[PDB]
């Protein structure tokens with residue numbers, strides 16, 4: 279395709295420059311700032327709640343036969359008493375540990391499926407809360 | 423609810439976060455994510471190993487709001503004087519990264535998008551034929567770590 283290398287070269291340039299800027303406390307864009315804040319928040323959460331997070335990840339083990347409903351059931355228990363930014367971070371971290379576990383078990387095919395389940399969950403459940411609570415820009419200000 | 427603008431940006435956040443978690447354990451979301459990660463790490467390794475020599479390189483270009491592509495190209499051309507290799511491509515990315523950081527430090531934020539476009543032009547004009555001839559970015563990933 280005519281524009282393939284332009285498009286992938288630009289992607290590589292943007293990624294590398296976003297990374298270099300973030301290392302010095304700068305950001306390529308507002309979306310890059312949201313991504314960075316969420317990456318760091320996930321590390322912080324996983325470190326502070328290591329034992330409690332281990333109890334959560336033990337609740338679900340994805341197989342090629344696992345239905346979205348099983349993921350949605352576990353994630354729903356995480357938000358039964360309500361939503362907050364910390365619980366949203368825990369949701370992202372949970373999805374990340376399910377993907378890690380899938381590749382550990384040589385089921386890399388499940389990674390794209392988990393990503394699609396996470397995006398479905400966010401769309402079906404969490405957008406009204408994100409919007410009412412100032413959006414991802416408020417998360418960046420609260421985290422930083 | 424319905425599939426609006428927030429669902430698309432939320433999917434982008436999911437992909438970015440999963441890519442980051444997988445990379446922490448030595449895994450990758452995709453081949454493109456693997457290239458991006460290898461280049462990020464190679465840049466860090468280069469900047470650490472050649473800190474003094476790299477400082478001499480970055481000092482060669484005095485960026486200003488009037489700096490043209492030609493001035494970046496002159497300095498970069500010197501870097502590839504003895505030919506192209508993966509290490510000098512890593513040094514080229516690191517150089518562009520340091521110029522962006524310097525621009526923001528000096529409150530000339532406008533130059534960042536100008537540097538990204540210079541890098542893409544230099545990449546397409548001078549380095550891409552060599553990259554295709556030498557196994558592409560996938561070979562760089564296999565060679566690196």
Ligand SMILES: Cc1ccc(CN(C(=O)N[C@@H](CS(=O)(=O)CC2CCCCC2)C(=O)O)C(=O)c2ccc(-c3ccccc3)cc2)cc1
Nearest residue numbers: 319320322323327330331334362363364365367368420421
């Ligand atoms: C990065 C980060 C994430 C989370 C916590 C912990 N935390 C928390 O501090 N809640 C605050 C209210 S808030 O969420 O708005 C605070 C912050 C969150 C980060 C962005 C800015 C706003 C509070 O109670 O005052 C929790 O809400 C929480 C605790 C445990 C779990 C859990 C642990 C294992 C398994 C299943 C759930 C989930 C969430 C700290 C730091």
Ligand SMILES: Cc1ccc(CN(C(=O)N[C@@H](CS(=O)(=O)CC2CCCCC2)C(=O)O)C(=O)c2ccc(-c3ccccc3)cc2)cc1
Nearest residue numbers: 464465467468472475476479507508509510512513565566
């Ligand atoms: C991460 C990493 C990057 C680069 C070096 C250094 N290096 C190197 O080792 N080059 C070899 C081998 S290679 O490049 O084909 C492939 C290597 C390097 C890239 C990842 C895969 C493995 C060679 O001689 O060809 C160089 O080519 C080099 C040295 C100095 C400079 C410089 C330093 C300051 C200012 C201006 C120039 C630039 C490049 C080490 C580690």
